[PDB]
């Protein structure tokens, strides 16, 4: 899922010096919400391996994956990869690495704490709309693991302190808001752990050689197509479309360079805006993403209202938004977009609930006041000009757009090269092919777009000598 | 760019950027002038202390409130307040920040016209908009229906909203507010032996009111208890000593809200105006208004006001309805939170009164559909 | 394929696929418009609430029935009703589904022509047909003779049929129906101190009329009983409390059917019109017509209407004639059941009006012998 990116540095004399690794666009929605036929990250399943008994009893982990709420919603287990020796291999790789085993144990215990965040329960009060917990055993054990106080954590979750002017005041939270905050905290702590791990790996990998010009290597998820497309697939499709637009612009620049080299210069119209017409209906204001982000802020929003607003603001007014199609008994379709890869339809249901990422400031302060390493991950988190978005005003889509923009401010500074890998068949048998599979691979790889852009100009170019030695015999 | 949300309010000016969870700057709206001569030469005292600075020099200044009940009465003081807020509090140039302003219902149109003229001419704000306090309060409360009671320091009013549709004929406005409560507290403290007259001691009386006063669930029972028991007496420390103890005067000051006959007002209490406003609306929406009673404003912050008002409304209303009162802990700043939410909406960006529109149509553009 | 049986009626649109036991979608035929302005922005309210949605927003909408008395007076509203019925309640595209329509006897030809034109042009149905609302009710009763009294909300009519041969010269139509009864109840409830004026609370009054009103066997005796005792009084709970009690008004509302002079109409009562239509026919079929009285329509659902009507008609009719009244429990939906039965017939498949036939012959095809 995450956009792995490795920068390979070189010395002054053009010799290999060092390697720098970075990560981008890691998806947080997978942690909490999973599709019915899909699993979560391999981490949680690997921890539940029974071949290591010490971790389970020292963390007081229930050995049954069914009991845990965060995991059981998706498909429980598949025969993808045998988790046991993979977990032992990762543990061995960590052991032979630069840091000690106490950090590894902190990693496992933090993951176990993330696991126990789903057991939290809350109920309404006597004669008030405020929410109070009923059970506290899971809260007690989680606080014991994090080295916090259960009473303080519960008070922070139920009654978040906020700063107004020069005085602190307490805010009220209902059940829905506290559940959203609990999910957002679990996603955020996982993100911070992953980023810190990446920084540690980069530091360990680092050599003392000077870093002159580098060669970047970028790996990104493809233009995945399903019959049940959702928000997670929408973000991936939008990122892939941005990358395809970048490739189209680069190829147009190369074609213009060749034209000016050969002195054969016509059709100066840029090849970017044709694809950017679809981009402008996603990231720009009054786009799909902007309307989605606004809608969740309205406290009475519902899926029907969101669909009605999309139809009012985009049906017929835009050149890409259009009605969905019902084919071969597909389960649901609400709206259909047109991309470089064809017609894609997405399902609205469930988008509004999972877009919210309201973080809690007092819980982050409590983490900073903790007695564990966790304070390092949450060291800095959230007058003469400020635009600091509030904790409530936090959407996954906004973070996705920000990360994509900061990635484009970095990738555009380097001359790009493209490598495409195509699976020949769905089966392991060599030689045989699946034609629809190759069609789908070509469509998602953008080769059809490349040949289409090449075909509108003059794609066939032959030297005068070759033309004479082949076609002069005609007259 | 980013939007700016400024709430002039009454007795407290609170402002901050849109998309924030709380106002950055909160300070009293006071302009003070030195009333003495001044003998030291070289310091060069300024001729006007504005904002929270006047609180520090409270003992040598005449504190004047620029607004009485919502309406601005001293415009020059209001330019001073706005300039202080924009420069010494937020440290931003309003030349590139749209400004959202909050304004109470049923006020003179000249007030809004002058407000917009000042914003567009003196500060040259690119765009601005004026909204009603009750709508913002309902925004911040996470609701789409229900009748909201906004009681600040300037004026108390109720605005019933159902499904995002207002009922203008059912809007009731009452001028009883926190300032009148402070004045009645002064009038009732002198019967014990403490006299407060100067405008500097207005702040002391207000602080006593904020710190000690509370609303009694029953009036006669509490008076009977206080006539014999002395468990209701609490001491307060003045800024120079001579602690004062107040007995039944602590729960008698906020009773003016439910008994406006104490200060000579003819109208009825807030618990009765809310019921009358509910019965003003249509018969098919009275249940939802009953079940979504919303509170906001600083004056509604007294301990036990929610229980008293619920008991009164339950007495008034038919016995077959469930009366529920929503009192979030952040009543005081609810309006500004609603303003931040409103300004952060994407579809609101086309409802601003731009500079071109104001230039073309004059100050009268405010009363168009961009209400 | 399948056929759609739509029954517009008046005040209740009921529809469903042919061959079903009961109609699938039943909802009032009203169109609502917001009469207020709306202060909350970003919600994006629609400009017209149609169907059962408007019943939930009665308090902020004005309700207009697109059908006054059988005929359609607001064609845009009727088109909205039809579109809602086809695309939301049934969720079936009418492109490949024939439709069967119903309307009252003795209606303007322009109404039928415009209905046919709209249904071929706007919706592009493959075929359609119009049937009398009384003949279908006769089918649904498993009969082939006798008269049928279709007292709906818009119009009341009698159609005598003997052995499948209709008698056009004996058809009697009366404009008194459920809407007039509701209006009369609204008028006479004022004498008890309850005022209902808004179109929204007309629905409330209709609820009281449905729930409590009943037809008295004797008028003078029930009047004396209600004036002397108080055992006939019942209480109804309004949507906002304040339970109200109705006494003598309980049975005065439905008596307008047998006493049209209460609302000022000169025409005779229901029983008298039925008897006049019976004797308007021939002399050799009067016995069968007497023995097969059929009741249908919502208005004929009052408790005790059958006994009173039988007593009245027996008083009018000769003593040596047996009088029977058929009152099935499903009077309200009888017309749609008959329509479904008719559309399920195999011999009826050749009576549809094909789109090509309409194009070749024009809108006047329906009135032509190709009925
Ligand atoms: N805890 C409290 N108890 C009682 N009264 C309070 C409390 N806090 C504030 N007030 C009163 O509320 C007033 C502030 O109201 P405010 O919300 O500023 O009104 P506006 O929004 O119109 O400016 C003060 O004058 C003060 O008397
Ligand atoms: N049991 C009942 N008691 C009183 N009124 C009734 C009853 N049933 C139906 N009605 C009245 O009949 C009307 C609906 O009749 P309906 O047959 O649906 O007319 P249409 O077929 O023209 O739509 C309603 O207005 C309702 O008030
Ligand atoms: Mg206020
Ligand atoms: Mg009918």
For tokens 């019109």, what's the residue?
C273
For tokens 């939930």, what's the residue?
C56
Q: Which of A297, A298, A304 to mutate to test the interface with C (most CBs of C within 10 A)?
A: A298
Which residues sit with Cβ closer than 5 angstroms to ligand 3, an ion? B 9, 152
Q: List the beta strands (DSSP E) in chain C.
A: 4-7, 13-17, 25-27, 31-34, 49-50, 61-64, 99-103, 127-132, 147-151, 156-162, 165-166, 172-174, 234-238, 241-246, 293-296, 325-326, 353-354
Task: Point out which residues pair with C128 in neighbouring strands.
Answer: C99, C353
For tokens 């702590």, what's the residue?
A189
Q: List the beta strands (DSSP E) in A270-346.
A: 335-339, 342-346
Instruction: Look at C42 and A305 and tell me if their CB atoms are within 8 Å.
Output: no
Q: Give the other-Cβ count within 10 Å of B336's Cβ.
A: 27
Q: How far apart are CA C299 and CA C306, in angstroms?
A: 12
The tokens describing B251, both together, are 């729960």
CB under 8 Å to C28, separation ≥6 — which residues?
C11, C12, C13, C51, C52, C54, C55
- Kindly state if the Cβ of B178 falls inside 6 Å of ligand 1: yes
Per-residue buried b or exposed e for A337-349, using 16+ beta carbons within 10 Å of the residue's own CB: bebbbeebbbbbe
Instruction: Look at A164 and B23 and tell me if their CB atoms are within 8 Å.
Output: yes
Instruction: Look at A298 and C46 and tell me if their CB atoms are within 8 Å.
Output: no
Which is it for the CA torsion A69, A74, A79, A84, positive or negative?
A: negative
Q: Answer whether C3's CB lies under 8 Å from C99's CB.
A: yes
Rg of chain A in Å (alpha carbons) = 26
What residue in A sits closest to C40 (Cα-Cα)?
Answer: A298
Q: Answer whether C253's CB lies under 8 Å from C181's CB.
A: yes
For tokens 């439905």, what's the residue?
C254
Nearest by Cα to A385 from C129, C227, B91, C347: B91
Nearest by Cα to C198 from C239, C242, C233, C235: C239
Q: How far apart are CA A107 and CA A101, in angstroms?
A: 10
Q: How far apart are CA A345 and CA A91, in angstroms?
A: 42
Q: How far apart are CA B324 and CA B51, in angstroms?
A: 38
CA dihedral B121, B122, B128, B129 (to 10 degrees): -100
- Kindly state if the Cβ of B146 falls inside 6 Å of ligand 1: no
Q: Answer whether C105's CB lies under 8 Å from C69's CB.
A: no
Nearest by Cα to C284 from C149, C144, C162, C160: C162
Q: Give the other-Cβ count within 10 Å of C132's Cβ.
A: 21
Q: Give the other-Cβ count within 10 Å of A49's Cβ.
A: 17
- Kindly state if the Cβ of B28 falls inside 6 Å of ligand 1: no
The tokens describing B292, both together, are 């979504």
For tokens 């909204």, what's the residue?
B131
Q: Give the other-Cβ count within 10 Å of C365's Cβ.
A: 19
The tokens describing C63, both together, are 């309700």
**Cα(A437) to centroid(ligand 1), Å:** 68
Q: Answer whether C170's CB lies under 8 Å from C156's CB.
A: no
CB under 8 Å to C255, separation ≥6 — which residues?
C215, C216, C219, C262
Q: How far apart are CA A249 and CA A241, in angstroms?
A: 12
Q: Answer whether A362's CB lies under 8 Å from A156's CB.
A: yes
B86: DSSP letter: I
> Helix or strand or coil: residue C14?
strand
- Kindly state if the Cβ of C301 falls inside 6 Å of ligand 2: yes
Q: Answer whether B77's CB lies under 8 Å from B64's CB.
A: yes
Q: Answer whether A174's CB lies under 8 Å from A105's CB.
A: no
Instruction: Identify which of C41, C60, C200 has the shortest CB distance to residue B163.
Output: C60
Q: Answer whether B23's CB lies under 8 Å from A164's CB.
A: yes
């Amino acid at each position: 899922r995450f956009g792995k990116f490795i920068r390979i540095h070189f010395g002054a004399t053009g010799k290999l010096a060092s390697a720098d690794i970075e990560t981008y666009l890691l998806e947080k929605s997978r942690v909490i919400f999973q599709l019915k036929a899909e699993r979560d990250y391999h981490i949680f399943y690997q921890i539940l391996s029974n071949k290591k008994p010490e971790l389970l009893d020292m963390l007081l982990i229930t050995n049954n994956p069914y009991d845990y709420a965060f995991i059981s919603q998706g498909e429980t287990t598949v025969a993808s990869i045998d988790d046991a020796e993979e977990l032992m291999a990762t543990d061995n790789a960590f052991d032979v690495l630069g840091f000690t085993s106490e950090e590894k144990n902190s990693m496992y215990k933090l993951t176990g704490a993330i696991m126990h965040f789903g057991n939290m329960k809350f109920k309404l009060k006597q004669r008030e709309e405020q929410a109070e917990p009923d059970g506290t055993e899971e809260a007690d054990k989680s606080a014991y693991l994090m080295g916090l106080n259960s009473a303080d954590l519960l008070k922070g979750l139920c009654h978040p302190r906020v700063k107004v002017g020069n005085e602190y005041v307490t805010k009220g939270q209902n059940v829905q808001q506290v559940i959203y905050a609990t999910g957002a905290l679990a996603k955020a702590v996982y993100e911070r752990m992953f980023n810190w791990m990446v920084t540690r790996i980069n530091a360990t990998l680092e050599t003392k050689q000077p870093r002159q010009y580098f060669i970047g290597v970028l790996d990104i998820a493809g233009f995945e197509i399903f019959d049940f497309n959702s928000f997670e697939q929408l973000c991936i499709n939008f990122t892939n479309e941005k990358l395809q637009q970048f490739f189209n612009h680069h190829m147009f620049v190369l074609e213009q360079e060749e034209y000016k080299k050969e002195g054969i210069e016509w059709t100066f119209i840029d090849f970017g805006m044709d694809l950017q017409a679809c981009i402008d209906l996603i990231e720009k204001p009054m786009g799909i993403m902007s309307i989605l982000e606004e809608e969740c802020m309205f406290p009475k929003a519902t899926d029907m209202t969101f669909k009605a607003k999309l139809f009012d603001n985009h049906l017929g007014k835009s050149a890409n938004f259009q009605k969905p199609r019902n084919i071969k008994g597909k389960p649901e379709a609400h709206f259909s977009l047109i991309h470089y890869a064809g017609i894609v339809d997405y399902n609205i249901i469930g988008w509004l609930q999972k877009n919210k990422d309201p973080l809690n400031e007092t819980v982050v302060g409590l983490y900073q006041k903790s007695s564990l390493k966790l304070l390092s991950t949450l060291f800095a988190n959230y007058g003469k000009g400020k635009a600091k978005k509030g904790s409530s005003f936090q959407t996954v889509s906004a973070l996705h757009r920000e990360n994509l923009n900061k990635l484009m401010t970095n990738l555009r500074s380097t001359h790009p090269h493209f490598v495409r890998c195509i699976i020949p068949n769905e089966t392991k048998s060599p030689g045989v092919m699946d034609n629809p599979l190759v069609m789908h691979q070509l469509r998602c790889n953008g080769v059809l777009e490349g040949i289409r852009i090449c075909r509108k100009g003059f794609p066939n170019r032959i030297l005068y000598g070759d033309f004479r030695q082949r076609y002069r015999i005609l007259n | 760019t980013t939007a700016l949300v400024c709430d002039n309010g009454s007795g407290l000016v609170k402002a901050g950027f849109a998309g924030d969870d709380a106002p950055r700057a909160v300070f009293p709206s006071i302009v003070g002038r030195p009333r003495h001569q001044g003998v030291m030469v070289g310091m060069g005292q300024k001729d006007s202390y504005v904002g929270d600075e006047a609180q520090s020099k409270r003992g040598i200044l005449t504190l004047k409130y620029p607004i009485e009940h919502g309406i601005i009465t001293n415009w020059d003081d209001m330019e001073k307040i706005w300039h202080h807020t924009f420069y010494n509090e937020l440290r931003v140039a309003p030349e590139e920040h749209p400004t959202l302003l909050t304004e109470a219902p049923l006020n003179p149109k000249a007030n809004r016209e002058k407000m917009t003229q000042i914003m567009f001419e003196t500060f040259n704000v690119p765009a601005m908009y004026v909204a009603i306090q009750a709508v913002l309060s309902l925004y911040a409360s996470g609701r789409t229906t229900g009748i909201v009671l906004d009681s600040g320091d300037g004026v108390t009013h109720n605005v019933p909203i159902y499904e995002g549709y207002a009922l203008p004929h059912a809007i009731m406005r009452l001028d009883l507010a926190g300032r009148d409560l402070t004045d009645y507290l002064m009038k009732i403290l002198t019967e014990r032996g403490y006299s407060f007259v100067t405008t500097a001691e207005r702040e002391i009386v207000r602080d006593i009111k904020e710190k000690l006063c509370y609303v009694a669930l029953d009036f006669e029972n509490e008076m009977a208890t206080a006539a014999s028991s002395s468990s209701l007496e609490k001491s307060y420390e003045l800024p120079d000593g001579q602690v004062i103890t107040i007995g039944n005067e602590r729960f008698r000051c906020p009773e003016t809200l439910f008994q406006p006959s104490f200060i000579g007002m003819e109208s009825a209490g807030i618990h009765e105006t809310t019921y009358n406003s509910i019965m003003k609306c249509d018969i098919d929406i009275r249940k939802d208004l009953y079940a979504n009673n919303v509170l906001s404003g600083g004056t509604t912050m007294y301990p036990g006001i929610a229980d008293r008002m619920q008991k009164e409304i339950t007495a008034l209303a038919p016995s077959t309805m469930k009366i529920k009162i929503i009192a979030p802990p952040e009543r005081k700043y609810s309006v500004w939170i609603g303003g931040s939410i409103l300004a952060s909406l994407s579809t609101f960006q086309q409802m601003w009164i731009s500079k071109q529109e104001y230039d073309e149509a004059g100050p009268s553009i405010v009363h168009r559909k961009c209400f």
